[PDB]
Amino acid sequence: DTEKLMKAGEIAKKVREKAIKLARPGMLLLELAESIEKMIMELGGKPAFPVNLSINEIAAHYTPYKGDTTVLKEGDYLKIDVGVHIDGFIADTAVTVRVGMEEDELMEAAKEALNAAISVARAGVEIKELGKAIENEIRKRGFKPIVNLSGHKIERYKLHAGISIPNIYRPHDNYVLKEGDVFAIEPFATIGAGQVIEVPPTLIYMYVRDVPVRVAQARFLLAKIKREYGTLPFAYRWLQNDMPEGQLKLALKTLEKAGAIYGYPVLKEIRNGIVAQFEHTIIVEKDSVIVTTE
C-alpha cells in the first residue's frame, strides 16, 4: 500500500524538519527525542523506532534514556534518524546537522551521495550502481564511506529485510531493483577509517522470538514488549518507570540471553573519526523513484 507509506513519509519529513529547528547548542537530547517522538504521534504516526540522535564519532543506534544529560555543544555533528509507520508501512529518514554552524563538505559528501544514489535508481538497476555513485561522491571529496553500515530494503513491519544498499562498488551486489521495492538509502561518510564498532551501552532493542522464560518478572515484560511494540525496535527509555532501578536493565538482559529479544548496541567509528549520514526512504518505478521523505 502506497498512500500509507507516503503518509509515513510526509510525517517523517515534517518531524525531521522540526528536529533540525530544535537542534541548537545546549538542547537536551532526552527532551529533543521526546519532542520528536510526540510530534509523530501528534500527526497520526507511531514510531518505527526511537529517534537516533548520534553525535560525531558515534554513528547510529544512540537514543537517549531518562537521566541522559547529553546536550548538544556548538560544532557537534548530529545525526538524526527518524522512524515512522502507519499500519506498518515505514518511512525512514535521516539528516546530519552541525550545531550552530553551516554545512561542512563532510556533510555535503553524504548528502550528494544520497542524491546521486536516488538519481541512478529505477526499476532494473543493479544495486552496485548506487554503491559506486556513493563511493564516488565521498572519496572524491577526500572522504571515506562507511562500508559496514548502509541502506537496506524495507517491508511491512520490517525495518531491515534482506538487501543492503551499500556505500561502495562491489561487483556481486547484483540484486536487480524490482518495481515496488521500498528502500532506505543511507550513505555514511567519515574522516576516520570507514568501519564501525559495537560499544556499550545497548539502548535499543527488538522482539525477535516467542521463547519461554523461567523468571516470572521477565516473562511479563516480554508480554508488554510484544503488546506495545511487536517486531519494531523500541528504546530502553520507553519502558523506564514501569520498574525499580536496575531491575529493568537486568530484566532486559535476562530476555536477551533467552533469545527473545536482541539489543542494538551503539555503533561508533573504529577510529573516532566524525561521521555523516543522510537517508531517504524510496520506492521504485519503471524509470524513476518516489522519495517518500522529501
Restricting to residues 70-89, name those near Co ion by CB under 5 A: 81
∠ CA 62-77-187, nearest 5°, is 75
- Is 172 tagged catalytic? no
**Closer residue to Co ion in complex, CB, 54/254:** 54
Which position among 37, 57, 92, 137 is part of the footprint of Co ion (CB under 5 A)?
Answer: 92
37 catalytically annotated:
no
> Binders of Co ion among 193-252, rule CB under 5 A?
none
Span near Co ion by CB under 5 A; candidates 35-43, 140-148, 181-189, 210-218 = 181-189
* Residue 167 Cβ vs Co ion, minimum distance, rounded to whole Å: 13
Q: Binding site for a divalent metal cation, residues?
A: 81, 92, 152, 186, 279
Q: What's the first-to-final CA gap in the chain, in angstroms?
A: 19
Catalytic residue at 152? yes
| Catalytic residue selected from 37, 68, 92, 137 | 92
Please, which of residues 160-179 interact with Co ion by CB under 5 A? none
In the set 135, 186, 269, 280, the catalytic residue is 186
- Active site annotation includes 92: yes
| Smallest separation, CB 212 to Co ion (Å) | 31
Instruction: Please confirm, yes or no, whether 279 is among the known catalytic residues.
Output: yes
Q: Spot the catalytic one: 160, 198, 228, 294.
A: 160
Between 177 and 267, name the residue whose CB sits nearer to Co ion: 267
Buried b (16+ CB within 10 A) or exposed e, 149-170: bbbbbbeeeebebebbbbbbbe
Measured over the CA atoms of residue 138, residue 186, residue 173 and residue 196, the dihedral's sign is: positive
Q: Per-residue contact track with Co ion, 108 to 147, x per CB under 5 A?
A: ----------------------------------------
Q: Tell me if residue 68 is catalytic.
A: no
Tell whether residue 57 is a contact of Co ion (CB under 5 A): no
User: Which is nearest to 136 in space by CA: 114, 164, 152, 103?
Assistant: 114
**Considering the complex, what minimum distance in angstroms separates the CB of residue 186 from Co ion?**
6
Q: What cell does 139 get?
A: 572519496
Q: By C-beta, is 92 or 254 nearer to Co ion?
A: 92
Interface ranges with Co ion (CB under 5 A): 81, 92, 184
Name the residues annotated as catalytic. 81, 92, 152, 160, 186, 279
